[PDB]
């Protein structure tokens, strides 16, 4: 008989199966549609999630009740050290899909990138790319490289570059990994020859996040969500708990199927892996593209709040540390825990809405301690409130007498 009352089904059947992701890193399953009338440019970048804070800004949206008013919006900080381009790959169309034509490697490759080919680099022979380096720059090597580049010019419809992160530049004590994360970055815009020219000029060179994304733009995030291991139907699917009287347990689905079909359907909620799934999240507005603190210390200082502060809150980002490189400040949240590597992609959805076209100007960036209820914005403000303490007096008098 028909169900007594109707309610929408629990969960999205299009995110199936709810299994552990193949890779910890975010990977773009598709790139934004290529438009040849534009200049050649990179379509993606790799960042590291540092932490979260919130900002204050004025909304410019006529007809809204918050127009010309201040709002508080949570933001996510992601450290973005420069990427290094080491390879060029070309793709040609076939009736069975895209095929790689070849790979042009940079003549000199970083130790970081070569560590990705090993499980124990420190105890290994460290011979990666040694034969390739010797073969290159020879008469046969130069002809082979020209052969591959001409094959790209003649047959390739898609040109992508091979880029790796710099864990040495990301001087983080909690990430642990020292082998570089490697991803293919598509080159969109222009002709194939123009794409090849840009890729060649980018070989062995560094790429900054400000060269791929602008300040007030929006972007897509490819990342893997936080893991939770085995989880019951209540948390994994959001099914309602059974009454307290239920014998043998109440965190279950009562009926997992009718008599016929004499089977359990794939649409029924079951216990299993929750989290650690790859997600592509749309329309994450970039609120700030900050430079390295070593280049400009005042990262969280605005024209409205003139306090000299960095993006790192007092006490550091919990479990991450200090943001020491360039960073991207995205409105809202992104999938995945801190320290996880993530892929920022140029948006694939249309960017014509007023919200997506609004120019973002920040008036306040919170830098209070994320441990406890932070009530100070800077070290100086805390010292002004407390004044001299017992430890400070002991230190100052010892320096005055014993050392001066």
């Amino acid at each position: 008989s028909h169900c007594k009352f109707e309610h929408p089904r629990h969960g999205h059947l299009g995110f199936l199966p709810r299994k552990r992701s193949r890779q910890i890193r975010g990977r773009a399953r598709a790139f934004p549609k290529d438009d040849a009338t534009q200049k050649p440019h990179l379509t993606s970048f790799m960042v590291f999630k540092a932490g979260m804070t919130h900002i204050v800004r004025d909304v410019d949206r006529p007809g809204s009740k918050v127009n010309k008013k201040e709002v508080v919006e949570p933001v996510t900080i992601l450290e973005a050290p420069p990427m290094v381009i080491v390879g060029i790959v070309g793709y040609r169309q076939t009736p069975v899909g895209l095929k790689t034509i070849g790979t042009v490697w940079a003549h000199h490759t970083s130790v970081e990138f070569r560590r990705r080919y090993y499980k124990n680099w420190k105890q290994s022979a460290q011979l990666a790319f040694s034969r390739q380096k010797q073969f290159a720059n020879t008469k046969e090597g130069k002809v082979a490289e020209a052969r591959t580049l001409n094959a790209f010019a003649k047959k390739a419809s898609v040109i992508r570059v091979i880029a790796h992160t710099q864990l040495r530049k990301l001087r983080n004590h909690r990430v642990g990994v020292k082998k570089a994360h490697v991803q293919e970055i598509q080159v969109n815009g222009g002709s194939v020859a123009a794409k090849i020219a840009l890729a060649k000029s980018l070989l062995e060179k560094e790429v900054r996040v400000d060269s791929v994304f602008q300040q007030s733009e929006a972007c897509d995030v490819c990342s893997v969500t936080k893991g939770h291991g085995t989880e019951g139907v209540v948390k994994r699917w959001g099914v309602a708990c059974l009454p307290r009287k239920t014998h043998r347990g109440l965190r279950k689905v009562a009926c997992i199927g009718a008599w016929h079909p004499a089977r359990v359907m794939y649409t029924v909620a079951r216990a299993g892996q929750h989290g650690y799934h790859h997600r592509t999240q749309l329309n994450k507005k970039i609120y700030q593209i900050g430079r390295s603190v070593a280049v400009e210390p005042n990262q969280a200082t605005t024209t409205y709040d003139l306090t000299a502060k960095t993006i790192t809150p007092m006490g550091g980002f919990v479990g991450y540390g200090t943001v020491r490189n360039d960073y991207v400040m995205l409105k809202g949240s992104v999938s995945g825990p801190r320290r996880r590597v993530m892929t920022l992609r140029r948006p694939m959805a249309p960017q014509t809405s007023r919200q997506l076209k609004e120019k973002i100007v920040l008036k306040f960036i919170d830098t209070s301690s994320k441990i406890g209820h932070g009530r100070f914005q800077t070290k100086k403000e805390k010292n002004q409130w407390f004044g001299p303490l017992k430890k400070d007096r002991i230190r100052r008098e010892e320096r005055l007498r014993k050392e001066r």
Partner: protein, 186 residues
């Protein structure tokens, strides 16, 4: 380890020669970079040198940029078979949220594992003073910190092919744990 790095496969002479050659190569590469950075900073003017701060090992309270801390560490060779150390153990950081009835027994196990890793020993004996200190506030009132004297000895039984080492761990009464580091005592 891999076959190409095993001590038995290569032998002592080959392993030592490869290790020494690797260290000498690291020394020379660091020397090149030190010389280049010294030269480049010397030519560099005041304005651009103010940007390039900390590079040529100029700053204070900084690491050495050209190597690892482990490489610069001084190797004084094998420690003697008998050696005594005084060390603090942060027990609360290991016993957090443990079952209350198991805290004192687990703390004994954790201390034994802590010493065993330090001294490469499986025979770690707990002196009565240490056992009393761990248990003196009940099974669930283990102190958050302990100061222990670790004495390694060697005593093998006749016929054994490999020499036997063991440690005796005893309590060191302290009025305060602040400012105490690991020491090698006699």
């Amino acid at each position: 380890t891999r076959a190409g790095m095993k001590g038995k496969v290569l032998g002592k002479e080959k392993k030592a020669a490869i290790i020494d050659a690797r260290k000498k190569a690291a020394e020379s590469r660091k020397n090149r970079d030190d010389k280049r950075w010294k030269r480049v900073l010397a030519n560099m003017d005041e304005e651009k040198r103010k940007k390039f701060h900390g590079v040529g090992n100029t700053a204070k309270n900084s690491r050495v940029r050209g190597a690892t801390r482990a490489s610069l560490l001084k190797r004084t060779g094998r420690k003697p078979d008998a050696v005594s150390m005084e060390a603090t153990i942060h027990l609360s950081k290991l016993l957090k949220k443990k079952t209350f009835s198991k805290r004192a027994p687990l703390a004994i196990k954790r201390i034994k594992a802590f010493v065993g890793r330090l001294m490469k020993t499986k025979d770690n004996r707990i002196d009565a003073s240490l056992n009393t200190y761990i248990w003196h506030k009940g099974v669930k009132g283990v102190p958050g910190r302990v100061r222990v004297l670790i004495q390694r000895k060697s005593e093998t039984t006749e016929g054994n092919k490999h020499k036997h080492f063991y440690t005796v761990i005893s309590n060191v009464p302290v009025a305060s744990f602040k400012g105490l580091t690991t020491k090698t005592v006699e």
